[PDB]
C-alpha cells in the first residue's frame, strides 16, 4: 500500500539469573504494524537465533519524515533472494520522502525485476548530501542548472461521448 516507516525494538524474554536481555532495533517499511512486527520477527530469526515464541516486542514507533517538503536524492541499497544466492543492488531515486522512495523502488522491482515484497529486502536508504555523489544519468539529468522542458502532444480527457470540434494537442 502506501508505505510507512517504523522502528521495532524487541528482545529475548528475560530468564532466571540472566536478566535484562539486550535490545535490538530495526527500521521496517510496511503498510501497518502487524506487517511490521511480522517482518521484524522474520529478519530477527534470519539474522540472530531468536524466535518469536522466545522473544517479545518492546516498542514500535512510526518515524515521520523530517523535511517532507524538501526534494532529495536517495541511494537505496537492497538485496533480493535468488536460486544462485543473495544479490546486491543499488538504485537512485529522486523524491521528497523515504517512504515514497521505497514505494517507487518496490514498483520498479515489480515492473523490471519481476520481484515481490517478501523477496525484496530494504538494506539501507541514505540521502545523497552532495550532488557530485549522484552517479546515475537518469537522476543526474534533472540536476542541471536552469532546467526547462516542454510537454508536447497534450491529450485532454473528454467527459462526453461526442465532440463537436476537432481536438488540439497544443500546450
Amino acid at each position: 500500500a502506501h508505505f510507512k516507516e517504523y522502528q521495532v525494538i524487541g528482545r529475548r524474554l528475560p530468564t532466571e539469573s540472566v536478566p535484562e536481555p539486550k535490545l535490538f532495533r530495526m527500521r521496517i517499511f510496511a503498510s501497518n504494524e502487524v506487517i511490521a512486527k511480522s517482518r521484524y520477527w522474520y529478519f530477527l530469526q534470519k539474522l540472530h537465533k531468536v524466535k518469536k515464541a522466545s522473544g517479545e516486542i518492546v516498542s514500535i514507533n512510526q518515524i515521520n519524515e523530517a523535511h517532507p517538503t524538501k526534494v532529495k536524492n536517495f541511494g537505496v541499497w537492497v538485496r533480493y533472494d535468488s536460486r544462485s544466492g543473495t544479490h546486491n543492488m543499488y538504485k537512485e531515486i529522486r523524491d521528497v520522502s523515504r517512504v515514497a522512495a521505497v514505494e517507487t523502488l518496490y514498483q520498479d522491482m515489480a515492473a523490471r525485476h519481476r520481484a515481490r515484497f517478501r523477496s525484496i529486502h530494504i538494506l539501507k536508504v541514505a540521502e545523497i548530501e552532495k550532488t557530485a555523489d549522484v552517479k546515475r544519468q537518469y537522476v543526474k539529468q534533472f540536476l542541471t542548472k536552469d532546467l526547462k522542458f516542454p510537454l508536447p502532444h497534450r491529450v485532454q480527457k473528454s467527459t462526453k461521448t461526442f465532440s463537436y470540434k476537432r481536438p488540439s494537442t497544443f500546450y
Partner: peptide, 25 residues
C-alpha cells in the same frame, strides 16, 4: 556504487574492534 562505503567500512571496523573485547572483558 554506494556512496558511503567508507563510512560503512569504518562503522563495521569499529564494531569488530568493540566486539573483540566485549566478550573477553
Amino acid at each position: 556504487n554506494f556512496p558511503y562505503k567508507a563510512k560503512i567500512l569504518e562503522e563495521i571496523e569499529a564494531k569488530k574492534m568493540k566486539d573483540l573485547e566485549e566478550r573477553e572483558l
